Ligand binder design. Structure first.
Ligand SMILES: Cc1cn([C@H]2C[C@H](O)[C@@H](COP(=O)(O)OP(=O)(O)O[C@H]3O[C@H](C)[C@@H](O)[C@H](N)[C@H]3O)O2)c(=O)[nH]c1=O
Ligand SMILES: Cc1cn([C@H]2C[C@H](O)[C@@H](COP(=O)(O)OP(=O)(O)O[C@H]3O[C@H](C)[C@@H](O)[C@H](N)[C@H]3O)O2)c(=O)[nH]c1=O
Ligand SMILES: Nc1nc(=O)c2c([nH]1)NC[C@@H](CNc1ccc(C(=O)N[C@@H](CCC(=O)O)C(=O)O)cc1)N2C=O
Ligand SMILES: Nc1nc(=O)c2c([nH]1)NC[C@@H](CNc1ccc(C(=O)N[C@@H](CCC(=O)O)C(=O)O)cc1)N2C=O
Ligand SMILES: [K+]
Ligand SMILES: [K+]
Lengths: 270, 270
């Protein structure tokens, strides 16, 4: 019988499945639900379907998972909203890429940088019918490094999320895990509508904030931001005072300061 | 000679001047520079100009203060940015109503609430030529209570600002105070153009955030927020679950919940 389903994508799903097969269940006891964008090829992330091909793991549909009594359903960057009533199992779990209750919703590699955070986290929670609202089982809070891009933060999510899954999976299998109501205070949410990938930079901001408005959008597989129609691959915030509200194009980089006058080096793609 | 000049408005300027006269300097050793909104009339705050009238304190121009060597220049909600090179004195101080380096700029009774903070602060800093960028002498951080309005937050800034002035003024008069450069990290700025006082509420947000979008604009002397063209005097958030994305207009109030289902009561005006 299928004891566990991994639904989702990327290194967190693959490496979590790997850890299951090494320590808990056999290929017959596990199934995958891939994302609509999985096409069997490793690239900047490993493919779940490719892992499933290599290890003889069967694909199921959501509808199939609904009817599997006492399946552990683990959502690891799964692309589908799930109604808990459809599931015969109530052992439904999700790894969300934020320090819940903050930064519910999407683009959580962009939203904390853009909203001036210096920390984020990964949260293992119970799935309920709301978006990232379910009861928290565990959480790892970690720094946003000052020059991290959205891509760096995403990679840290994948890594800490894998660690949190590994740490918690035994008590989830054994059904000896605790869960707690999420606080209503400091609860925040961003829908897709709340992010403009092409947003005009506001230069009437601090160096930290101009730097954030650039680096929140540096994620080359998706996009790079532009200044004067030139793509930016990296932004560096220094503590060097160069004067208020500076802007100078060199051939390889822009030198920028905001209202507090700290030097930013924005490296051009050219 | 004039030893100290208080520039600005409201109970912090008046009460800090009263403290100077009781503890430090005679009326003939002090001067004021009132804000342009000061017509000499006590209202929901005391008039600095009215207080100077009753206490035989001289009004000076900025242009006069520039020429007074040794003057302790203290801005307490002063409405004008000064050019520090124009002063003969280097004893230029400001009380800013944020937890610097966060929320430089204006509307600091709105911006921390609107940006989901649970604390703010008052900061005593050296004036330099930037907006709220000068080195910190002292800071006091305090809670934003879950149902505080901008108005409540402003009255807390007034009282903690007055506290911090009275704590530090002796060390400032004896020139025995330390100052520290502000961090470049976590530095944030909001100008008048960054706030729309007729904020349209985004309901595709948590209960905390909808609540924040209402209570950040509750300051009756300036404006009240509206839902469906109806003025709101009070927003109350509890951790009570009432279902996701609720909106129920009653005769005297709205009952609202966001993506996480927490109870908001928005009380209608008179
Ligand atoms: C689509 C897209 C993504 N990104 C970055 C920023 C985003 O955090 C990250 C991952 O994108 P995603 O895989 O589409 O998912 P997202 O971060 O929006 O998270 C959400 O969607 C996924 C699929 C859910 O499983 C997850 N639980 C959701 O929070 O890649 C971009 O920079 N530009 C983009 O266009
Ligand atoms: C003008 C205005 C003000 N307010 C509230 C919100 C604001 O934080 C508070 C104080 O208004 P303010 O006196 O204009 O001061 P503000 O917070 O914008 O601070 C700035 O202006 C003052 C005058 C400077 O001395 C201060 N150092 C600046 O930070 O009153 C409103 O709600 N609506 C308004 O239209
Ligand atoms: N019931 C449930 N709760 C969850 O927290 C959860 C699931 N299912 N399924 C797995 C995963 C999926 N996460 C998400 C989160 C948001 C969107 C999404 O499409 N957001 C839309 C808004 C949709 C709406 O308003 O209803 C957007 O425009 O951003 C998709 C998948 N997840 C936990 O992460
Ligand atoms: N040089 C200096 N630095 C300060 O930090 C400081 C002073 N002066 N003087 C007293 C007080 C003045 N605070 C302020 C803050 C903002 C505006 C203001 O007019 N802001 C405009 C933007 C104008 C511009 O971009 O130059 C706005 O639209 O927000 C005025 C006074 N103050 C510390 O509080
Ligand atoms: K998520
Ligand atoms: K200020």
């Amino acid at each position: 019988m299928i004891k566990l389903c991994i639904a989702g994508k990327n290194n967190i799903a693959v490496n979590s499945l790997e850890y299951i097969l090494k320590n808990h269940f056999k290929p017959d006891q596990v199934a995958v639900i891939p994302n609509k964008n999985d096409f069997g090829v490793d690239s900047w992330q490993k493919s779940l379907l490719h892992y499933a091909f290599n290890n003889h793991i069967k694909v199921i549909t959501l509808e199939e998972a609904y009817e599997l009594k006492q399946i552990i359903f683990f959502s690891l960057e799964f692309d589908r909203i799930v109604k808990v009533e459809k599931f015969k199992s109530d052992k439904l779990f999700n790894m969300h890429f934020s320090a819940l209750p903050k930064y519910k919703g999407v683009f959580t590699s962009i939203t904390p940088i853009l909203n001036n955070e210096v920390e984020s986290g990964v949260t293992l929670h119970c799935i309920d019918n709301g978006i990232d609202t379910g009861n928290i089982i565990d959480q790892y809070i970690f720094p946003i490094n000052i020059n991290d891009t959205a891509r760096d933060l995403y990679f840290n999510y994948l890594s800490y999320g894998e660690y949190l899954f590994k740490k918690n999976i035994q008590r989830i299998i054994n059904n000896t895990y605790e869960n707690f109501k999420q606080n209503n205070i400091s609860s925040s949410y961003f829908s897709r509508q709340d992010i403009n990938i092409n947003h005009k930079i506001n230069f009437k901001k601090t160096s930290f904030e101009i730097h954030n408005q650039i680096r929140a959008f540096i994620f080359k597989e998706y996009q790079l931001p532009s200044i004067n129609k030139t793509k930016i691959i990296k932004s560096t915030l220094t503590n060097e005072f160069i004067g208020y509200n500076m802007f100078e194009e060199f051939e390889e980089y822009f030198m920028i300061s905001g209202i507090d006058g700290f030097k930013i080096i924005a490296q051009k793609y050219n």
